[PDB]
Amino acid sequence: GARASVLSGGELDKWEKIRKRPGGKKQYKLKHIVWASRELERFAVNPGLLETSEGCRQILGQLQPSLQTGSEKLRSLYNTITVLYCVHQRIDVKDTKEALDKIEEEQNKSKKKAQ
Amino acid sequence: GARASVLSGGELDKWEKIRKRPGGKKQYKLKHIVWASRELERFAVNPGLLETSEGCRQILGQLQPSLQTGSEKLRSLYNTITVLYCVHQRIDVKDTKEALDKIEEEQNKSKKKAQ
Amino acid sequence: GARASVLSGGELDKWEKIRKRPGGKKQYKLKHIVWASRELERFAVNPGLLETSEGCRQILGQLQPSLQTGSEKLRSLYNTITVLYCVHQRIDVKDTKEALDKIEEEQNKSKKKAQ
Amino acid sequence: GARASVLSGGELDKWEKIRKRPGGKKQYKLKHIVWASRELERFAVNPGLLETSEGCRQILGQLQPSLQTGSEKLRSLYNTITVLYCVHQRIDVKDTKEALDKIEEEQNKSKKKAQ
Amino acid sequence: GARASVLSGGELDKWEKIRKRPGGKKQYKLKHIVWASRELERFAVNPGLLETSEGCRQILGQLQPSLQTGSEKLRSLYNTITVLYCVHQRIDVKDTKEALDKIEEEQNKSKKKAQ
Ligand SMILES: *C(=O)CCCCCCCCCCCCC
Ligand SMILES: *C(=O)CCCCCCCCCCCCC
Ligand SMILES: *C(=O)CCCCCCCCCCCCC
Ligand SMILES: *C(=O)CCCCCCCCCCCCC
Ligand SMILES: *C(=O)CCCCCCCCCCCCC
């Protein structure tokens, strides 16, 4: 059943199409997904949350006060999970800037009805 | 990313613990997802819809008028798709009969707000 | 009682005396029923529906929407189910057209009491 | 009858100039027509309807109930028949996208008889 | 798509059952279609008009006010087009006279709606 993720136009096929910068050439690779698990394990957060959008969103919500002064690894991890949230929301983001704008669109859409 | 799904509590931890026959000593295995994938391909239906609860539920909606007249293979597929729906919904069902109770429970629940 | 499978003047004796095409001199065989089971098995329908009128009505209801554009084999199965219905009701019909007229007349009577 | 279908200036001559993508490298070939006739007999649809526009439209209707959750091959078959319908209607489409627009675009006139 | 015309029950198969004489024995043949194409080229007439009823109707309309003077060949062409017209409406006529009546018969209703 996990095979759905490797079908043409599925989530792992969609992931390695996404560009790092909005006009750049180098792409996102799946190695960043594996890398994320060990960082979550280090700080004692459950990697099982990266299975769905709803799980990814809990991680993204947690790190919001830390993020502003965060290291380059922490900000990059936040951007890496941001893309997993966008991919799990079925959004065909072409790059990081779009994924970040898509999160602001998701947060604006979410927050407006949840004050 | 499919590592997350096999961590305990994930979808492919839950899938293989569920009983086939309520007093039976046999449980559902991954072999029945490939069998469902073959039978859906034989019916010219997309097996990628098995990723999600809504895609499984759409397949359950599609095959419902054919169940009254359905074969052992069709009823067995309906039960296979039903358990995948229960797994995607994170419902801790122990067997086929609990999974069937949940579809009937959800359908009667659904009827009340569909009027 | 398997002895009833050779019943003289029964339904099986009549089956072999019913004409396939209405002016044609050639009759229905029991291997047609075996072929009908195999065609039903491909479309995932339960063969036991052949054995009762209650199942035959459901088969016809499911075949009718596809009849008009359906292939000759679909039409011949429709006619085969129609004759089995006439046989289960114990309606003597000499041929396929006679069976079709009797079943449409019985169905027409049913649809006046179906609302 | 319609032997004109394989002559210069005819339906095939036009068929093989229709592109897959507006400026695309590949075009449609005659052998898709032969394959489609074989596929229809598997579903048990009559292969004699294919020489007529309204028979082709009726076949497209018949393919709809599994199209929506349908496999890639079923969608490809439907779109290929759709382009052929446009060819039988003597519509000189530029490409695959136009054949898709023509179905909705022609139906807009007649769908205003149902508003 | 053209195979349908040669599959049993198709338009060529219907063509070939039609009598050349009202209560006759001899019928129309594929080699008459070849002959008809040869007669058309002699007067520089497009064959693509004999694909449909409307094209045939237009040719009959051109032929009609010249028939009184016409040769046995002109009458034969008129009869032949008329038979094709009836075939293209898919009317299983027994003979050439019936096909001719169908044209005058359409005029009894159509010309009365033309004024
Ligand atoms: C999701 O698609 C299931 C994960 C796969 C485990 C291996 C399956 C091997 C199947 C072999 C064929 C069994 C007969 C249907
Ligand atoms: C996402 O996590 C990428 C993972 C790439 C390696 C997968 C290795 C196999 C994981 C499933 C093992 C299941 C054992 C029962
Ligand atoms: C009598 O013993 C009751 C149980 C009957 C079981 C089924 C017997 C089927 C015999 C052959 C039927 C052939 C019909 C074409
Ligand atoms: C009526 O005029 C029908 C023609 C149908 C003939 C079908 C069999 C021969 C194949 C014809 C097409 C070949 C294209 C390469
Ligand atoms: C509508 O039905 C179009 C039918 C086209 C028939 C084409 C048949 C081609 C046969 C090729 C045989 C091999 C030649 C090397």
Residue numbers in the entry:
A (entry chain c), B (entry chain f), C (entry chain g), D (entry chain e), E (entry chain F): 1 to 115
Paper excerpt:
During virus assembly, a primary role of the MA domain is to bring Gag to the inner leaflet (IL) of the plasma membrane via its covalently attached N-terminal myristate group and highly basic region (HBR). The MA HBR promotes Gag membrane binding by engaging in electrostatic interactions with the IL of the plasma membrane. The HIV-1 MA protein forms trimers that assemble into a hexameric lattice with central cavities at points of sixfold symmetry on PS- and PI(4,5)P2-enriched membranes. During HIV-1 maturation, the MA lattice undergoes structural rearrangement, with mature virions displaying a more regular hexameric lattice and smaller central hexameric apertures compared to their immature counterparts.
